[PDB]
Amino acid sequence: ADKSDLGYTGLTDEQAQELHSVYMSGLWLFSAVAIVAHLAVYIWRPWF
Template identity: 40%
Template sequence: MNDPTPGDDRFGLRTYLTPEEAKEFHKIFMGSFLGFTGIAVLAHIALWAYKPWL
């Protein structure tokens, strides 16, 4: 594997992503993270309503 050429528009030494690919990955990652966090919050609220632990 060769490092990208200096004229290439890819970020970092080991990323090998173009700015458009990085933005797309970030969008998918953040959507997944927020979805998982939302489900976890709803599960905690439901469990708290069923059986408070404090």
């Protein structure tokens, strides 16, 4: 016995993602690009 609005059950996974997916999405975004800001910045110095 539970909600999952015996239909909301599915769309949930999507809404439930509206807060989750998105979360783990921007999460690994500013956590990778940043890493670039650390390298990409000290990476455009050397060229040879």
